[PDB]
Assembly symmetry: C3
C-alpha cells in the first residue's frame, strides 16, 4: 500500500490542495472553503512535493513529481497544468 | 529505521512545527523562538504532510497522516487537535 | 532508485528551492526567476523536509535532513548553511 502526500494552502479561507502519490499515480484533492472535491492534477509519479505562491489574488502552484530518480515539475498558473523548466541530474 | 518528516512555519520569529512519522506514529516538535519542545500532536501514521495559514494572528494547521492508503486530516485551530473533513478514495 | 523531494518558495518572482534526497545525499536546485541552477546545500540524508520565512526581504530556510531515525536541522540565514538546534528523540 503506502501512499505519500504533499499539501499546500493559500489565503485565509483557505484554499488547500493535497496531492497523493499512490501506486505510481499522483492525484489532487481540493478545498475552497466548503467541501472537498477532486482537482484537475493527474500525473505519474511515486513521490510528490509542492509549493505555491500568490501574485495579488492569482495562485501559482508547482508540483514536483518523481519516478525513480527523475523529477518533473508541473505548473498551475490559473489556466491548466503545464510542464515546467525544472531539471535535475540525479 | 527510516523516519519521514514534514515541516511548517509561521510569522517572523518564527514558529516552526516539525512532524516525524516513525514506526507508525507521528509526533511533533515545536519552536516558538527559544528552545525546542514537544507538541500536543500524537496520531498514527507512516507518512505525514502539513500546511498552515494565519487568519490575523491566529494559526491554523492541517496535518495529513496516512497509513497504508488511508489519509486522515487533523486540524489545529488554537484549542486542540480535531479530525478534519478530508476524504480521498485511494 | 526512488528519490524523495521537498520544496519551498518565497516572494512573487518567486524564488523556489527544491531539495532531493537520493542514495543518502541531499542536494538543492534553485530558481530565482530565470533559469534553474545548483544551490550550495549539500548534506547527507535519505529524507528531507523544508520550510522558510521572510523577515522583511531576508529569507530564512530550515531543512530537516533525516538518516535512519536521526533528524538534523540545517539553517540558511543569508550567509551559509549552519547546523540548527533542532533535536528529537526518535
Ligand atoms: O478549483 C480546483 C482547481 O482548479 O484549483 C486549482 C488547481 O489546484 C487545479 O488543479 C484544481 O482543479
Ligand atoms: O512559468 C513556468 C515557470 O517559468 O515558472 C517558474 C518555474 O517554476 C519554472 O521552472 C517554470 O518553467
Ligand atoms: O505551543 C505548542 C503547540 O500548542 O503549538 C500549536 C500546535 O502545534 C500544538 O500541537 C502545540 O502543542
Ligand atoms: O474547521 C475544520 C475544517 O473545515 O477546516 C478546513 C478543512 O481543513 C476541512 O477539511 C476541515 O474540516
Ligand atoms: O542563490 C542560491 C542560494 O544562495 O540561495 C539561498 C540558498 O538556497 C542557498 O543554498 C543557495 O545557494
Ligand atoms: O538561528 C538558528 C535557529 O535558532 O533558528 C531557529 C530554529 O530553526 C533553531 O533550531 C535554530 O538553531
Amino acid at each position: 500500500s503506502s501512499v505519500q502526500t504533499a499539501a499546500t494552502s493559500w489565503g485565509t479561507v483557505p484554499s488547500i490542495r493535497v496531492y497523493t502519490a499512490n501506486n505510481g499515480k499522483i492525484t489532487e484533492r481540493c478545498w475552497d472553503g466548503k467541501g472537498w472535491y477532486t482537482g484537475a492534477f493527474n500525473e505519474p509519479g511515486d513521490n510528490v512535493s509542492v509549493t505555491s505562491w500568490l501574485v495579488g489574488s492569482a495562485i501559482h502552484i508547482r508540483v514536483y513529481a518523481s519516478t525513480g530518480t527523475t523529477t518533473t515539475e508541473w505548473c498551475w498558473d490559473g489556466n491548466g497544468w503545464t510542464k515546467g523548466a525544472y531539471t535535475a541530474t540525479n
